[PDB]
Design an enzyme around this catalytic site. Sequence first.
Site, mmCIF file in Angstrom:
data_model
loop_
_atom_site.group_PDB
_atom_site.id
_atom_site.type_symbol
_atom_site.label_atom_id
_atom_site.label_comp_id
_atom_site.label_asym_id
_atom_site.label_seq_id
_atom_site.Cartn_x
_atom_site.Cartn_y
_atom_site.Cartn_z
ATOM 1 N N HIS A 162 0.865 -1.180 0.000
ATOM 2 C CA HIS A 162 0.000 0.000 0.000
ATOM 3 C C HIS A 162 0.906 1.237 0.000
ATOM 4 C CE1 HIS A 162 -2.942 2.945 1.249
ATOM 5 N NE2 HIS A 162 -3.893 2.038 1.385
ATOM 6 N N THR A 178 -3.179 0.054 9.106
ATOM 7 C CA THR A 178 -4.618 0.065 9.382
ATOM 8 C C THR A 178 -5.244 -1.331 9.319
ATOM 9 O OG1 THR A 178 -5.117 0.685 7.094
ATOM 10 C CG2 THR A 178 -4.936 2.491 8.717
ATOM 11 N N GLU A 199 -9.928 -5.816 2.051
ATOM 12 C CA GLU A 199 -8.500 -5.523 2.275
ATOM 13 C C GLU A 199 -8.014 -5.960 3.654
ATOM 14 O OE1 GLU A 199 -6.767 -1.303 2.842
ATOM 15 O OE2 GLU A 199 -6.265 -1.816 0.757
#
EC number: 2.4.1.40
Lengths: 278, 278
Positions: B166, B178, B236
Amino acid sequence: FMVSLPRMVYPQPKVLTPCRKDVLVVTPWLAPIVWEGTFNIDILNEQFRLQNTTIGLTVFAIKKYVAFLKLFLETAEKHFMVGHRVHYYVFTDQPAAVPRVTLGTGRQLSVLEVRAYSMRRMEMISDFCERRFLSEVDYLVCVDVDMEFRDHVGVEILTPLFGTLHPSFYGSSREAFTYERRPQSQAYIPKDEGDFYYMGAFFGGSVQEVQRLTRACHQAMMVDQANGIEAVWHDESHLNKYLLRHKPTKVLSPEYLWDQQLLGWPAVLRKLRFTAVP
Amino acid sequence: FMVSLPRMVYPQPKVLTPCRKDVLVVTPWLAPIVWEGTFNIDILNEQFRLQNTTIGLTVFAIKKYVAFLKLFLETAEKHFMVGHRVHYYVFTDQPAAVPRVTLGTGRQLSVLEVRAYSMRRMEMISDFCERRFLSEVDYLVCVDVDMEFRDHVGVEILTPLFGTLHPSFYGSSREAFTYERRPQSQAYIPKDEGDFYYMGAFFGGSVQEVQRLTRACHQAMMVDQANGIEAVWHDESHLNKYLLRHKPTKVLSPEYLWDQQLLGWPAVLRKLRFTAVP
Ligand SMILES: O=c1ccn([C@@H]2O[C@H](COP(=O)(O)OP(=O)(O)C[C@H]3O[C@H](CO)[C@H](O)[C@H](O)[C@H]3O)[C@@H](O)[C@H]2O)c(=O)[nH]1
Ligand SMILES: O=c1ccn([C@@H]2O[C@H](COP(=O)(O)OP(=O)(O)C[C@H]3O[C@H](CO)[C@H](O)[C@H](O)[C@H]3O)[C@@H](O)[C@H]2O)c(=O)[nH]1
Ligand SMILES: [Mn+2]
Ligand SMILES: [Mn+2]
């Protein structure tokens, strides 16, 4: 099918921090080059134990070379694939001269008698032992006997096909590599070709890929024999031709094949794992 | 069976010269991290063409996101797997809104109609398309549509299983990732675990490994739904849990998923290959 790894606590890999800045750690065909500091052995041990990996180790001890077996095997017990299933295959003309070596649990040794005489090892690994190896092990590792283990040699090496950088040539230009240079030999490599000079003393892979390699090298050696030519470095010349045309999926650094008497202990080698006996 | 590579003239890889000193190019489980300068595309193109490799590319364009297809497909034609066999699979609620895009030879596009609504993509890739993909392609690549190709994306990415870093987190510590942090979710990852934060916008692998991943993520999302919890970053979050427990065999650098508007063009990125559309 590969089951999930368990929770593990280990240092975070950081993308903007290389683990080695002094050496090439990946080939231009995206095969890892295995050096100390490039792998977390705890992750790799988990991955390979979850597959109940069995490693076969082949070693030839013919004529006077039977004298090398005791140290070879005893040090393999200390350093080679400890914790994993290992099957040693000792090929010899003198079964009675094989030393009685005590093995750790999950490890076994088979003594295979061969004739004494170039072509033996490649032919023996491929033609005679094909069915046995496919039934008994997942990976095959093929090494010289005139050696000892001094440090960890483990599942970090395992991959479909690997070669090992010859310790005399890892810093050399390709024109200096001792490839077979006569176009009349099947092992011929021109001066403008070659990635690395791989040593015949340590190669391996999955059983399927090792059988492919040893079959191809044996066939190429038979062609050479029919044409009255013997490659400069015998099966090693053919191994080099094969690995030029079929790229290995890992390359082992010279930590994995060293000669301290001839080459000392350079800073670039953090560990000397498998070394020549004088 | 892999046939021999032909003779090739290219620069010798030198072991005592890294091709990148500024970045990590291999993970601690010995998976290459793909950056410009780590691969010779001519060697890789040879290897994959000799296998007549077919790459499937899946893309979802639901509701207003159909507007992104023209640029996505037209730039994929310029940059994605050029020279190789490609099959695009466009999943949409509006088959008539799919633009007519001219394709190079050896490339095909299938329009697959789905319902409009989290779980769609993983379920659609696994449950509905399993048999089709196994019959038609060797590798599957699964990407977001709100994107464009700006530079080469080719066979260097292909491997049994890959994720992509990412672009917001490649320089971050794992506590900042995250990940789903609630222990009640199947996607839960504690603060002391994690290798990387992978983006849901670009993952892939062999058909078998992609089916395994998408099945596992779909099953995990269904458990979460039954337990009245939705992971912070939806599929995700689950992709990240999966790739923590099943390590990818390559990791793509942020060259492969970038946002120039939000992040500019750092020196560490030599190419911006696949980028967000504003
Ligand atoms: O009578 C025998 C003869 C051989 N063998 C078996 O064959 C293996 C290879 O031979 P050797 O080690 O002599 O080669 P090396 O000399 O280590 C061959 C290596 O060194 C060369 C210089 O001596 C070059 O550097 C070459 O590149 C390199 O491969 C040996 O370890 C035994 O398993 C046996 O059992 N009985
Ligand atoms: O109506 C729809 C909605 C979705 N889709 C499809 O789903 C894909 C993902 O959604 P999106 O790109 O909005 O996520 P992103 O916003 O790019 C998700 C990404 O950015 C986040 C911030 O916005 C976070 O950074 C996150 O980590 C990252 O994954 C989209 O490309 C379409 O193929 C569709 O076809 N129709
Ligand atoms: Mn030797
Ligand atoms: Mn997106």
